[PDB]
Design a protein around this ligand. Structure first.
Ligand SMILES: N[C@@H](Cc1ccc(O)cc1)C(=O)O
Ligand SMILES: N[C@@H](Cc1ccc(O)cc1)C(=O)O
Lengths: 266, 266
């Protein structure tokens, strides 16, 4: 005879990080809409992070991003076509540069979503990080209109908060879009509007930067007669509201008591 | 000191069945197109397997499906709305009945894909099984046209065989569609056309059966002013060509030497 209620061999049981879970859900939501996920580098060139996105130097708009500037010789930053890119190095302040890289390397129409680690020089508190994640979206092609951007986010909301969810758009500014907009989604349970992210129609100067860099690389122009929309949303804020995580600082804390709590979560 | 090239603890390493892999790829291909996967029961009623799909008794068309008829009291077959359905029981000869179940239980527009185990009374050889799998597709909604069906399969092909892949449609008969069609996809490597599955525009009588069963259940009609397309494709045939599996019989053989060979495969 054997006691069957006796503990068995202590085989280890793994788990996924909250951010990996939230990012996966977001990526799934958009895959169902035809978006494909691709990634960019965490260490970027000012050209891709700012200049190519219509964000000058000593431009008031630069202030919307507190940047970590890097230094050191011997580092090789490869451009979209594997080339050796140059320019002052920094930690990307957002995933947006990736939409420039992708466009020089591909041709419309397409739908991409690019999750990624981003960095801002900031003070770490209960709802603020210097190291966090964003999910960028970019859909370009003949006839793409703001009505489609709104449709996308409407689908994001429904997919995230159920049939009783709603979306709200208000004009807001971004050097890389025009019209520009901020969007919030209605969260029926918490009974409140959550400011989710920014978006808009890709700015004319962005398409121009893309086709200039293409020509400078021998590629033919590809974004002359197309339009598109782009959006960007913070992951931690969403992960927090979705898992009831009180301190944004727990994500990079590494505390098992914390991480372990998400083994169930799919 | 320790020999580091010495074998480590023999922790077990799992794996997925070839069919699970192929089905997963197919389901992913279509999820990117907005289709959602749902399943039906393996033991069906003649009503759902045949009658509701415009396939009479002692109808020549019945012969396109060699059926396993079942017997035994005490079995409860639940309909789409959980009700107690009746009718001669059988093993579903295809996943098609599931498109009737789904429609009585939902409202257009929608996109579904239903993978599933099916049964045909047949002799088991190198390329034939009595027990195999199918993947059904069903997209219904205002304005849905055959041009969309073709677009779907075009996307299936591209997704499965690359940019140099092509699709081919030819008229063929199915009591549940009109127009009816068979489609083949060009496989650039094997340099040949693969007859993949059947499809067409959902037959008027199918929508009628759906709305009659709905009314008989108190639900209001929902498929009066819509159209849709449906397709069905065999999985084993595809899995075989895709993994280079020579004998369709290996799938249900249970031989580890065989199964083990697909641990890598994603
Ligand atoms: N990249 C911006 C957010 C954003 C992203 C895409 C847009 O189209 C607009 C705004 C940020 O770091 O806050
Ligand atoms: N159900 C059919 C194949 C098929 C499926 C869907 C269709 O719309 C047409 C044909 C079979 O068992 O072979």
């Amino acid at each position: 005879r054997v006691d069957v209620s006796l503990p068995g061999a202590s085989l280890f049981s793994g788990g996924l990080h909250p951010i990996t879970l939230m990012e996966r859900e977001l990526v799934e939501i958009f895959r169902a809409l035809g978006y494909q996920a691709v990634e960019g580098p965490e260490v970027e060139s000012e050209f891709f992070n700012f200049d190519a996105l219509n964000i000058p130097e000593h431009h008031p708009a630069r202030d919307m991003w507190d940047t970590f500037w890097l230094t050191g010789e011997g580092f090789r930053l490869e451009g979209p076509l594997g080339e050796e890119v140059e320019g002052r190095l920094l930690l990307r302040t957002h995933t947006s540069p990736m939409q420039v890289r992708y466009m020089v390397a591909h041709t419309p129409p397409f739908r991409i979503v690019v999750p990624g680690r981003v960095f801002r020089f900031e003070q770490t508190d209960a709802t603020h990080e210097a190291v966090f994640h964003q999910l960028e979206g970019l859909v370009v092609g003949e006839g793409i209109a703001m009505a489609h951007l709104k449709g996308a986010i409407y689908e994001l909301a429904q997919a995230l908060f159920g049939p009783d969810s709603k979306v709200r758009f208000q004009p807001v500014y971004f050097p890389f879009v025009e019209p520009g907009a901020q969007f919030a989604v209605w969260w029926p349970e918490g009974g409140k509007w959550l400011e989710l992210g920014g978006a808009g129609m890709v700015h004319p100067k962005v398409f121009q930067a893309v086709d200039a860099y293409r020509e400078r690389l021998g590629l033919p122009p590809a974004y002359r007669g197309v339009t598109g929309f782009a959006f960007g949303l913070g992951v931690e804020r969403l992960a927090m509201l979705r898992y009831g995580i009180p301190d944004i600082r727990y994500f990079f804390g590494g505390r098992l008591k914390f991480l372990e709590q998400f083994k169930g979560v799919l």
